[PDB]
Amino acid sequence: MPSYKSSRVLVRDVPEELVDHYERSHRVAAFFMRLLLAMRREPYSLRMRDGTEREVDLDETDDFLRSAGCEEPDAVSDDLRSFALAVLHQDNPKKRAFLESENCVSILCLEKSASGTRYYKRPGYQLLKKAIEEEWGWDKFEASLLDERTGEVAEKFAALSMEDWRRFFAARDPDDLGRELLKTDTREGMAAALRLRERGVFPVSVPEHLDLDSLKAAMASAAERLKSWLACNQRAVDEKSELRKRFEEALDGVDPEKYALFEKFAAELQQADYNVTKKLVLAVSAKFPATEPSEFKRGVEILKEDGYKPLWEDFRELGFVYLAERKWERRRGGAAVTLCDADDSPIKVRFGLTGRGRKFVLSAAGSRFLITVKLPCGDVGLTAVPSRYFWNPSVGRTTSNSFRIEFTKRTTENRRYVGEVKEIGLVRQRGRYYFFIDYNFDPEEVSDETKVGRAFFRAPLNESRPKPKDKLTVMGIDLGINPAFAFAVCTLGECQDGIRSPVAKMEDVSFDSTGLRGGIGSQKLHREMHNLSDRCFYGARYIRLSKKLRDRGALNDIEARLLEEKYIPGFRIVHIEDADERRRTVGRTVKEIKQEYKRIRHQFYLRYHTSKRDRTELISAEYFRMLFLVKNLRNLLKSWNRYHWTTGDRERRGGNPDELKSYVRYYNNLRMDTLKKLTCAIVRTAKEHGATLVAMENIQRVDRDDEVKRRKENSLLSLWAPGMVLERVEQELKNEGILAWEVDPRHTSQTSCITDEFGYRSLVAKDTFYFEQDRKIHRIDADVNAAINIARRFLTRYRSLTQLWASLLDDGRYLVNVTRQHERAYLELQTGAPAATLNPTAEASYELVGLSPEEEELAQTRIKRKKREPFYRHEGVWLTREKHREQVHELRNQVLALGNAKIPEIRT
RNA sequence: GUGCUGCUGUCUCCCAGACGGGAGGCAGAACUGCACCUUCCAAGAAC
DNA sequence: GTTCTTGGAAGCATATCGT
DNA sequence: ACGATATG
């Protein structure tokens, strides 16, 4: 719930006393992870050190329960299951037995304990009893418990019988009803545990002994890991049940006898050494009496008509059902249990100030942290190697059982930070010892005016919400690849000069400051990153074709043309007809590609290590191009290592577990660095301008009508999942006190921000956008225009809609489908009714007319005629896709005829 | 401290199979640059 | 060639009896 | 006051 940040410090050597504690803690943690799973009478799977999944059947779990101390782990199965469910938090969140999963150690791993007998905190009972006993009227208590409540806690404390509870209170400050409540409000888990102790199963035998705090830390880590495993396993079971449902759905749609005949066909085809796959099913479904390509003749041309004529017309759906069944039969039935290991899957050996783990004293001196750990054996003083994250630390103890640290995070700026440390954690990574300083952090307050403004601006026009009522500063973002970031900021109360934009129910605002960020830092390096990436992309295809050339002599016609038209030119090579020589030429080409990759990578490293340092930028397009080059080189190398797959199209999965490990590592690390630097740039631009509210492009959805952001080689979606990017930028803008919203990008890249009409984005000068103003042709930067459009959409609350879907009623009219509340708001404001239809006009356009609610059913009577259709807005009329592009093409032919010289430029 | 992140020399293990590729270790030289919540986890996709 | 929108586990509070 | 369980 709180805010968190962390970094690791390096402890050079740790005495043998702390080493032994680390290993014994890991041992006990593994023991608990094993014991909780065992307590469940449910088989599971383990990921062993070498990757092979064992299946621990009930035998090994029963033997483990026996070794742990249980004399007969057969009849006590149900109580153990209840306890396991309780400790892993699979119980009622209100009646939860163990709010923290480490509260169970004392009842389990100790001889003398009082769990389940103490009652001083169970409900508010004791506190309320003493409070009323502190000279407060019982009528007030009864009222506040019965009728003054609407959702308060007092309602949920009252598990007792009121007609008898209000008879107990006659006695002064009693505890008899307290014991009654203790034995009445039994939580199932703790009752099961008490039954187990009385039975004689508990105080189980632990591994190498430790004090209670170490046991609590081990239990916490084990419980965390097992709860993650349970969540993953539940999702796995859900997906497999969904697959079974899909199999049932597919099977219900065919004749079972025909499905059995198709099963016979598939079995015989497999006996013919052909495994059933979507590709061959589709190939066979093309034309049964015809001849399939050479890739399928061996398996098809000997079985296609051998008694399987009856299912020729149904082969398609029958193959679909067979594929569904064979997918369900092979998808994982569960998720394997990764298990704790001091060197293979370390846990955090944790130290806390309130019982969880053993205490520690965090100290600083001479620019380095001095950690002190109160191990049972004694006291251990460690010196941490200086860190530039926590530079020049200072630390003092607060009166809240916490340490307050003030430090400098080294950057261009050297801002001081302040956070609180309450838990510290050990870990052994690549042999060395580290401490995870997880520390708390309080961001900026975020003013109430900002929240009012956000609620106002994100709402549709048909929802009344209070006005911003303040001089907010809103800024837009347009995320991209080449220009990673473009912005435009307005002050919401001033229109001194610049591009103007309406604001909902306020004066007009001006985008005084607009800019471009990112872009090409160096031209040559970007061009070479682009070329070398293209070679790898096409090289893998050349390898794929060469392999099946060597296997089957000649390609099919179309795939052969692709080799000459696309692959050979784009993967510089002289195509040798000989099969043997193709290996050696391909290897030589891969050698050249690796040398070029090394050169480019070195130049990219000289960013910060040449006198040109000062002219580099926090983020440049090279980051994004370098990610694509790495991604494509991974594919090319993976194809080359797989060249000798003689079978040509048969699977040999498994093999090397590392392979291109260095390239995957580099890809992930460079992605992380790029995302971090990008978000730093956005946040710093926002702060420099005071943008307390930030409108953002919603990359989750792609505008199909755009030509730049739609393709694979230019999309951010190809490097990250869209959710991972905006969430990171959203979070730290918040941490700096800036609230941000996501706006739909539909037609923002191809609609004017001065005018409201469509235009042209150049296919050659990709960074320019053309439109018409005063019937003169002007141009602007295609990315600042997108930012202004996003901000304008945020500010006007989506007043102007550029696209509308419709369906063709047979009358010759189109009915508008409304599903987003912005559509309803627009259709209401422009016409006056919730729904409307587009009526043709003689000038080859359709006009909105609006409908009364009654005729909606009449329109629905015919709406089923056709599919959804797109319609686009121009100069106050609406026109169709085939004619929308015509108007854009007219502007295209006009611009190429006019030239850049006669075109004025808008400022940016 | 973790990355961005490399170079020279040099040793070792794998897949080729005589064209090449892929895990790692060790010793040097060049630069004092830019960022930094981590941990635990199994656009690609349909026809 | 023509279109569409991965989630989970964690990173401590305070109360009370006895010296 | 502070320490050792105990459990929101």
Side-chain angles (χ1 to χ4, degrees), chain A residues 1-651 653-908:
Chain A
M1 225 76 230
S3 37
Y4 289 111
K5 293 202 158 138
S6 88
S7 192
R8 285 178 253 168
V9 294
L10 171 61
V11 278
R12 197 71 76 175
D13 58 350
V14 313
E16 247 294 345
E17 312 70 333
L18 178 55
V19 174
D20 270 37
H21 183 263
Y22 177 90
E23 275 110 341
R24 285 181 298 178
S25 188
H26 271 83
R27 219 160 297 151
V28 64
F31 171 84
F32 281 138
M33 210 164 332
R34 195 176 290 277
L35 183 103
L36 279 192
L37 282 163
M39 282 195 207
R40 306 174 64 227
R41 287 304 220 90
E42 167 48 51
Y44 66 107
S45 57
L46 298 97
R47 184 171 319 181
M48 201 55 98
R49 305 268 60 78
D50 57 357
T52 194
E53 264 90 328
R54 294 187 74 234
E55 301 63 357
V56 152
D57 72 87
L58 290 178
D59 192 25
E60 188 155 10
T61 72
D62 175 286
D63 217 37
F64 193 79
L65 287 171
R66 192 170 292 94
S67 79
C70 158
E71 85 284 15
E72 184 159 40
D74 158 11
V76 296
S77 177
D78 302 340
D79 300 324
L80 268 69
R81 207 197 312 271
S82 305
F83 172 93
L85 265 53
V87 172
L88 297 184
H89 286 177
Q90 280 204 358
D91 57 337
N92 177 285
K94 302 307 301 184
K95 294 272 178 162
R96 199 178 291 286
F98 305 98
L99 185 55
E100 288 339 281
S101 43
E102 68 224 82
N103 296 356
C104 52
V105 285
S106 176
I107 174 144
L108 181 63
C109 310
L110 211 76
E111 294 53 12
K112 184 44 136 46
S113 39
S115 56
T117 67
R118 291 340 168 201
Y119 47 71
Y120 307 82
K121 298 172 72 171
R122 284 281 265 93
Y125 150 56
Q126 277 273 93
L127 299 172
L128 271 288
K129 192 197 82 186
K130 279 193 288 187
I132 301 303
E133 287 287 8
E134 288 274 33
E135 203 164 32
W136 276 103
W138 282 107
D139 54 350
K140 201 263 285 190
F141 169 82
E142 277 175 21
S144 56
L145 187 141
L146 298 166
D147 57 5
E148 298 275 29
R149 48 153 277 285
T150 187
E152 285 79 353
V153 296
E155 182 188 79
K156 298 163 176 65
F157 293 157
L160 293 175
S161 163
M162 168 200 30
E163 58 272 352
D164 211 14
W165 193 2
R166 305 312 308 144
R167 186 187 66 90
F168 299 158
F169 88 104
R172 293 274 62 70
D173 73 329
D175 64 320
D176 189 31
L177 73 84
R179 291 138 66 173
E180 289 294 316
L181 174 36
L182 179 62
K183 79 172 170 70
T184 300
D185 185 47
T186 49
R187 303 88 82 108
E188 173 37 69
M190 188 94 107
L194 270 158
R195 263 131 59 185
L196 283 176
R197 273 185 69 100
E198 266 306 340
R199 193 73 163 266
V201 182
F202 270 21
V204 304
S205 293
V206 289
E208 283 91 290
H209 335 306
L210 319 93
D211 75 298
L212 195 61
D213 298 29
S214 325
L215 264 62
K216 288 209 282 171
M219 202 46 208
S221 201
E224 288 154 22
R225 254 185 156 89
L226 280 182
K227 283 176 270 184
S228 87
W229 172 75
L230 269 186
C232 182
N233 188 51
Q234 278 293 102
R235 279 188 174 281
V237 170
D238 293 352
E239 72 152 298
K240 86 178 182 179
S241 78
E242 270 289 321
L243 280 173
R244 226 294 289 281
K245 215 284 293 173
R246 304 318 172 93
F247 169 46
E248 287 179 43
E249 193 82 26
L251 180 60
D252 190 43
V254 297
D255 179 4
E257 295 187 20
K258 307 301 189 290
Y259 185 55
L261 189 57
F262 193 100
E263 277 207 281
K264 199 183 186 280
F265 170 84
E268 283 173 2
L269 182 59
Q270 287 160 214
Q271 286 172 10
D273 204 24
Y274 265 79
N275 288 302
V276 178
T277 63
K278 192 194 297 191
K279 190 177 287 289
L280 77 79
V281 168
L282 292 173
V284 174
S285 301
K287 285 292 173 277
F288 308 102
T291 60
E292 290 74 23
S294 60
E295 185 163 322
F296 316 97
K297 289 189 178 185
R298 170 59 177 164
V300 177
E301 297 275 60
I302 61 169
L303 187 65
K304 185 162 53 184
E305 69 276 67
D306 192 11
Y308 297 108
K309 298 287 294 192
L311 58 79
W312 273 27
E313 287 72 24
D314 306 329
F315 187 93
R316 195 72 157 276
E317 49 261 52
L318 294 169
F320 294 166
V321 177
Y322 189 82
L323 289 164
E325 189 178 323
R326 298 294 175 256
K327 174 164 58 174
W328 172 81
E329 280 194 307
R330 291 185 289 181
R331 187 68 173 162
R332 283 187 177 267
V337 166
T338 179
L339 208 81
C340 163
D341 180 277
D343 296 87
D344 268 6
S345 46
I347 51 165
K348 286 191 188 170
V349 165
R350 284 201 290 171
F351 298 104
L353 291 309
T354 43
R356 181 185 279 169
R358 315 280 286 100
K359 290 183 174 180
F360 67 95
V361 185
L362 203 67
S363 296
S367 82
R368 74 171 90 230
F369 279 136
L370 307 73
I371 303 170
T372 308
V373 175
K374 303 296 185 77
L375 290 181
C377 94
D379 210 312
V380 166
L382 305 167
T383 287
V385 179
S387 171
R388 281 182 172 172
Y389 189 115
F390 299 128
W391 190 251
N392 227 32
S394 159
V395 58
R397 182 129 52 192
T398 72
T399 55
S400 188
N401 262 14
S402 172
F403 297 89
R404 182 197 198 251
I405 60 173
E406 309 74 354
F407 66 90
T408 301
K409 192 192 297 171
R410 294 283 290 256
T411 39
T412 278
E413 63 272 15
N414 294 334
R415 138 152 297 282
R416 268 293 224 210
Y417 282 77
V418 179
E420 273 185 39
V421 175
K422 293 178 289 194
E423 284 190 21
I424 285 296
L426 255 178
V427 70
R428 191 155 75 195
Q429 297 202 255
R430 58 188 72 158
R432 316 221 279 291
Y433 278 114
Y434 288 142
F435 265 118
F436 281 90
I437 297 180
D438 297 305
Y439 72 90
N440 290 109
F441 147 68
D442 258 2
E444 271 56 30
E445 76 295 340
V446 154
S447 84
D448 36 18
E449 311 291 20
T450 313
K451 324 173 62 73
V452 173
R454 166 142 68 100
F456 172 73
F457 285 129
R458 74 158 140 141
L461 286 160
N462 82 16
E463 183 185 319
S464 182
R465 306 292 284 267
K467 253 161 52 163
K469 198 219 71 184
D470 199 16
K471 299 278 304 309
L472 268 164
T473 305
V474 168
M475 191 195 68
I477 312 289
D478 207 81
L479 299 173
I481 271 293
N482 174 343
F485 160 41
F487 74 97
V489 47
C490 68
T491 168
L492 204 79
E494 325 197 11
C495 204
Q496 51 270 17
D497 198 44
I499 298 167
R500 305 159 91 271
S501 169
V503 174
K505 320 328 305 270
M506 281 165 138
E507 301 298 327
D508 283 17
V509 305
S510 176
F511 289 100
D512 215 41
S513 291
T514 66
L516 210 81
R517 294 293 191 269
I520 280 173
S522 63
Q523 313 294 330
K524 291 182 70 180
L525 200 58
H526 187 278
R527 215 192 321 121
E528 290 149 24
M529 283 186 190
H530 206 176
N531 280 343
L532 190 65
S533 179
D534 279 348
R535 286 184 78 174
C536 298
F537 189 101
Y538 294 140
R541 316 301 154 69
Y542 183 98
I543 288 169
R544 188 181 66 79
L545 292 195
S546 188
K547 276 206 301 183
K548 108 181 309 305
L549 262 198
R550 182 270 322 294
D551 303 333
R552 296 181 171 119
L555 274 297
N556 71 56
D557 58 352
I558 181 160
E559 220 154 87
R561 184 166 70 88
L562 262 173
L563 175 61
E564 156 45 359
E565 189 260 310
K566 203 76 79 197
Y567 299 156
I568 287 164
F571 170 80
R572 263 81 67 72
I573 198 160
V574 177
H575 185 67
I576 328 306
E577 47 272 343
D578 191 349
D580 191 58
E581 278 75 331
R582 274 201 300 300
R583 277 205 317 288
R584 293 191 276 277
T585 296
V586 170
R588 184 131 50 80
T589 322
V590 171
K591 169 172 79 136
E592 302 140 21
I593 287 166
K594 267 299 308 304
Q595 288 185 350
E596 184 75 333
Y597 172 83
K598 302 279 200 33
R599 211 184 60 65
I600 288 168
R601 184 178 67 180
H602 188 78
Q603 294 297 326
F604 193 46
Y605 156 88
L606 260 54
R607 263 165 328 142
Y608 309 106
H609 302 284
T610 63
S611 307
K612 307 296 193 289
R613 251 183 310 263
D614 322 68
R615 313 231 79 61
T616 60
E617 204 205 349
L618 174 57
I619 186 159
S620 68
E622 291 85 78
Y623 284 72
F624 301 95
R625 278 272 78 99
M626 190 73 228
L627 280 164
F628 286 113
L629 172 60
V630 172
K631 178 180 211 66
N632 288 136
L633 184 56
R634 303 222 300 102
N635 277 340
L636 177 67
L637 293 175
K638 197 141 80 55
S639 196
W640 178 238
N641 286 4
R642 211 87 74 242
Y643 195 101
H644 66 264
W645 251 235
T646 186
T647 313
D649 54 27
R650 185 252 294 276
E651 301 188 330
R653 62 184 288 156
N656 274 81
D658 44 22
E659 197 146 47
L660 295 149
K661 185 178 284 190
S662 75
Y663 284 100
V664 176
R665 177 172 62 233
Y666 179 57
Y667 178 74
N668 282 288
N669 299 130
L670 179 61
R671 269 209 304 172
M672 215 192 67
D673 178 49
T674 305
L675 186 59
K676 294 193 170 159
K677 284 172 176 162
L678 175 62
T679 301
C680 185
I682 308 174
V683 174
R684 285 168 59 191
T685 303
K687 279 188 36 182
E688 174 176 70
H689 293 301
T692 301
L693 194 62
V694 171
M696 221 184 214
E697 191 183 8
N698 185 343
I699 78 190
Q700 289 88 296
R701 28 170 310 109
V702 173
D703 190 353
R704 274 79 75 216
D705 207 31
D706 200 348
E707 192 60 23
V708 299
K709 299 201 188 185
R710 190 183 79 239
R711 186 174 314 88
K712 175 163 180 152
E713 177 261 299
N714 315 338
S715 185
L716 280 169
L717 311 183
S718 188
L719 307 174
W720 297 269
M724 257 197 264
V725 183
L726 303 190
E727 289 175 43
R728 165 92 61 220
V729 190
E730 261 295 359
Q731 273 283 30
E732 327 154 15
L733 268 75
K734 194 154 188 354
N735 300 129
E736 294 300 317
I738 302 131
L739 297 177
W741 189 249
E742 311 215 359
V743 179
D744 276 49
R746 216 202 267 288
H747 301 346
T748 58
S749 63
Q750 43 184 90
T751 278
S752 182
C753 65
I754 306 331
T755 53
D756 185 39
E757 311 287 39
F758 284 94
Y760 183 49
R761 187 193 267 241
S762 309
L763 295 171
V764 278
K766 171 273 273 184
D767 81 67
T768 54
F769 173 80
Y770 298 114
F771 63 85
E772 60 189 313
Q773 184 179 19
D774 324 285
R775 313 320 307 274
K776 268 174 38 58
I777 300 304
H778 295 224
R779 67 188 208 258
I780 198 154
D781 226 3
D783 311 306
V784 62
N785 161 247
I788 295 162
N789 273 336
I790 277 143
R792 185 161 178 276
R793 188 152 295 167
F794 194 62
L795 265 45
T796 59
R797 300 170 70 172
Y798 221 163
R799 174 32 191 281
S800 154
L801 261 189
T802 50
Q803 199 186 42
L804 263 157
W805 282 10
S807 291
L808 172 68
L809 306 171
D810 53 27
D811 288 342
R813 298 164 58 202
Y814 291 87
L815 175 139
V816 157
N817 165 49
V818 295
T819 76
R820 300 211 218 219
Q821 201 182 359
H822 330 76
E823 254 177 80
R824 274 162 82 219
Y826 177 82
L827 214 57
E828 281 285 10
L829 254 178
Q830 291 290 108
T831 71
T837 65
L838 294 168
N839 294 7
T841 173
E843 298 190 336
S845 46
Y846 307 79
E847 293 336 284
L848 279 168
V849 291
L851 310 194
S852 186
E854 185 70 5
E855 48 268 36
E856 175 61 20
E857 292 207 327
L858 274 61
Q860 294 275 351
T861 56
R862 280 82 57 66
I863 201 70
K864 298 184 179 75
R865 187 64 66 208
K866 307 279 287 300
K867 200 183 70 176
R868 310 288 163 72
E869 190 80 308
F871 280 83
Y872 302 61
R873 194 199 75 236
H874 286 261
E875 198 57 29
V877 317
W878 288 82
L879 48 68
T880 180
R881 181 139 81 68
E882 232 66 57
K883 310 205 91 56
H884 159 54
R885 274 201 291 290
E886 174 34 74
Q887 293 284 110
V888 152
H889 272 177
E890 213 73 344
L891 185 62
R892 184 151 81 71
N893 326 98
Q894 187 149 23
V895 165
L896 281 293
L898 181 59
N900 279 12
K902 310 298 183 178
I903 290 205
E905 163 201 76
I906 298 195
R907 277 299 160 196
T908 297

